[PDB]
Amino acid sequence: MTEKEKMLAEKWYDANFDQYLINERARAKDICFELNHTRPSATNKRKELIDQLFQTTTDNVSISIPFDTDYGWNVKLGKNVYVNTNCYFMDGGQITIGDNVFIGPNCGFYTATHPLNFHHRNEGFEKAGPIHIGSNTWFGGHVAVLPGVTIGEGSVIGAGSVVTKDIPPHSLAVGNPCKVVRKIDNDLPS
Amino acid sequence: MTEKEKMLAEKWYDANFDQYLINERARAKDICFELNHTRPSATNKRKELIDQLFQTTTDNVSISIPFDTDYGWNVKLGKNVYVNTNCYFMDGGQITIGDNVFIGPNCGFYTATHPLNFHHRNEGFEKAGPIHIGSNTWFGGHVAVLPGVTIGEGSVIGAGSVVTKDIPPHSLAVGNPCKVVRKIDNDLPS
Amino acid sequence: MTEKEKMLAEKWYDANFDQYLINERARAKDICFELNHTRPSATNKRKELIDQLFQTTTDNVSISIPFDTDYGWNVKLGKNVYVNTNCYFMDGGQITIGDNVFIGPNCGFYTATHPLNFHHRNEGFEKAGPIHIGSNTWFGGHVAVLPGVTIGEGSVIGAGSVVTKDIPPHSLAVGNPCKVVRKIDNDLPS
Ligand SMILES: CC(C)(COP(=O)(O)OP(=O)(O)OC[C@H]1O[C@@H](n2cnc3c(N)ncnc32)[C@H](O)[C@@H]1OP(=O)(O)O)[C@@H](O)C(=O)NCCC(=O)NCCS
Ligand SMILES: CC(C)(COP(=O)(O)OP(=O)(O)OC[C@H]1O[C@@H](n2cnc3c(N)ncnc32)[C@H](O)[C@@H]1OP(=O)(O)O)[C@@H](O)C(=O)NCCC(=O)NCCS
Ligand SMILES: CC(C)(COP(=O)(O)OP(=O)(O)OC[C@H]1O[C@@H](n2cnc3c(N)ncnc32)[C@H](O)[C@@H]1OP(=O)(O)O)[C@@H](O)C(=O)NCCC(=O)NCCS
Ligand SMILES: [Cl-]
Ligand SMILES: [Cl-]
Ligand SMILES: [Cl-]
Q1: Which DSSP string corresponds to B32-85?
Q2: Beta-sheet strand order (sheet of B150-151)
């Protein structure tokens, strides 16, 4: 297996010294740099850069600068995804985002782990844990979502949360560590 | 009522599709972009841009880039307000800041709420809860202040706090959620 | 004593009105601005700016933009230090970082304190508490390290942590406030 293949298979992989992955990260970082220095009202150019970054034709994906990602192509996006300022989709592990998702400012979606043992860590190895963000979700500002976490459809994550564990659907969850506080009634309003 | 008027009255309003509000946000975002790409030692130009953004003649309001706000004109500022890097004054609900206020880096003042029910949320409706920041206050870095919160004059908010509830005056408060730990003696020193 | 000397001696000092310190901060802010607007693939120029900022010849110190520091020369760096996006080394108090250190995105290392009493605070006085970051450490994203804190060699700090107290070596620690959860076995792997 190549190191990319290991990364995508939840295996330890050489994130720091694999040339292919280094080059892919460089591609993404240079696009993010361009995007981050493009006037917010230059709508067409921003759309072009977003679509180049994610290697997809986005449908109402609104990205407020600055933005960061590692690969770009490993973020799978639905439609109507609103990302406020200073977010980071750290996507060595796939980040899948549904439709109608509101992401507050200063949110970090982190799929990367390093070994706890410093000898193995210092060698550059990482293991990526995919993040799944359900459709119909809302994240307050200052949230961190950790590797391997799934947030269920219809759920709301309070500002400042550190999401260490999966959040069931149709739930309001807050805190460090983030815990369900109540269910959300999402039935069709009258 | 116009949607602006609803916003300013603590009513649900169409944040996402109201043209007037969309244009006002665009005004602010373009000024912030200019400010964020102005050399920190270009003192005059930075002052001009700050005053244009907040639609006021500021008196020793120090803004370290980058900075973000939604409207700008809905942040009411006293004198001697020091704002370190990467703050966001999300001001659909008025943010009132007193005199002699020290705001640490990476602080978010969030007045926006969305409906919990995804059907209403997906429609773009928001409700804004004003934030009041007393004079003579200090915020550590990495603080999030939530909608409708008042921090009393003379109070100190520890780094990393998530301020979910009002903080009384002359109090030290820390944590997620942020809780008063002790009173502060602010009497005139000898 | 000059105000710089007071700062470096853990004494109250006039951070806001001392011309020497004001000018030193301006030097650093202008370099950070240049660095933050330099293409990530302009390797040589970025290295030059980093080395100018820290007033040292760095050895594999990787700084992802944007970055911020107050003085630059008061950050003492080992080799193989990886700093992801949006970090701030607030270094009025010396920040000493060992070798083989992985620092996640949106981390703040804060050495500055202000007086709690607003009368003394409003005068501009600060007191700096040095931060020591051991070799062979890993910080998740969204961590804040507070004044005077030491993180021991071989330790790992979980994402979102607010590190209020010293962390012993060879420990995993998480939370707000950050607390040791277990020891880390760092013995030489087979
Ligand atoms: C959680 C949230 C969505 C709604 O809160 P709510 O349902 O109205 O609940 P309340 O505010 O009445 O508080 C419920 C309890 O949870 C706590 N709580 C609420 N939000 C919290 C949060 N983000 N973090 C930690 N605790 C929180 C409250 O302190 C309270 O504790 P108590 O039971 O001891 O009194 C809101 O607090 C929030 O985080 N909003 C996001 C704001 C934001 O980020 N806006 C910008 C992007 S649009
Ligand atoms: C709260 C603060 C202002 C002063 O702390 P303090 O009054 O000296 O109190 P101590 O450090 O002795 O700790 C008091 C207790 O509260 C806790 N605590 C202190 N600051 C805390 C914080 N920010 N978050 C969570 N807990 C905190 C400590 O862990 C300790 O718990 P214990 O009773 O179990 O021992 C300081 O911790 C802080 O947050 N400083 C801001 C630093 C900063 O952001 N600087 C950059 C901008 S200038
Ligand atoms: C702490 C960490 C390093 C490893 O966690 P771990 O050893 O696998 O432990 P677990 O995930 O099994 O959880 C252990 C417990 O601590 C809690 N916990 C774990 N990480 C936590 C964190 N960062 N903050 C708060 N609580 C945390 C869990 O909720 C769990 O609580 P429980 O005992 O009630 O079940 C990981 O959670 C983390 O923070 N990773 C960093 C991710 C990151 O920032 N990546 C980007 C930069 S590379
Ligand atoms: Cl938002
Ligand atoms: Cl500050
Ligand atoms: Cl990292």
Answers
A1: HHHHHTS-TT-HHHHHHHHHHHHTS--SSEEEPSSEEESSSTTEEE-SSEEE-S
A2: B75-77, B95-97, B131-133, B150-151
Asked whether C130 and C148 are in contact (CB, 8 A), the reply is yes
Contact predicate B31/A42, CB 8 Å:
no
- Given the structure tokens 């949320």, which residue do they identify? B121
Assess contact for A103 and A81: CB atoms under 8 A: yes
Closest of B55, B60, B61, B96 to residue B73, by C-alpha: B55
Residue-range domain boundaries for chain B: 1-190
Q: Tell me how far CA of residue A44 lies from CA of A40, A51, A166, B135, in angstroms.
A: 10, 11, 37, 43
Give the tokens for residue C96: 């000493």
End-to-end CA distance of chain C: 54
Pocket probe mutation, ligand 3, options C174, C180, C183, C184, max atoms within 8 Å of Cβ: C174
Specify the DSSP class assigned to residue C167: B
For residue C14, the surrounding DSSP H or E stretch is strand C13-14
Chains B, C: CB contacts within 8 A come to: 81
Q: Residue C143 in contact with residue C161, Cβ under 8 Å?
A: yes
φ and ψ at residue A20, rounded to 5 degrees: -60, -50
User: What's the rounded Cα separation, in Å, for the pair A153 and B118?
Assistant: 10
User: Any chain C CB within 8 A of the CB of B186?
Assistant: yes
CA B134 vs CA A66, B102, B104, C15: distances in Å: 30, 11, 15, 23
Distance CA C106, CA C33 (A): 17
Question: Position C185: which residue type?
Answer: D
DSSP three-state, residue A158: coil
3-state class (DSSP) for residue B117: coil
Rounded distance between C-alpha atoms, residue A128 and residue A10, angstroms: 6
Strands (E), B71-141: 75-77, 81-83, 87-90, 95-97, 101-103, 108-110, 112-113, 125-128, 131-133, 137-139
The residues of B that are catalytic are 114
Fold of the CATH domain A1-190: UDP N-Acetylglucosamine Acyltransferase; domain 1 (2.160.10)
Contact status, residue B108 vs residue B90, Cβ threshold 8 Å: yes
H or E element, residue A32: helix A19-36
The shortest C-alpha distance from B131 to chain C (Å) reads: 21
Chain B: give the shortest CA distance to residue A4, in Å. Answer: 33
Q: Dihedrals φ, ψ of C2, to 5°? A: -75, 165
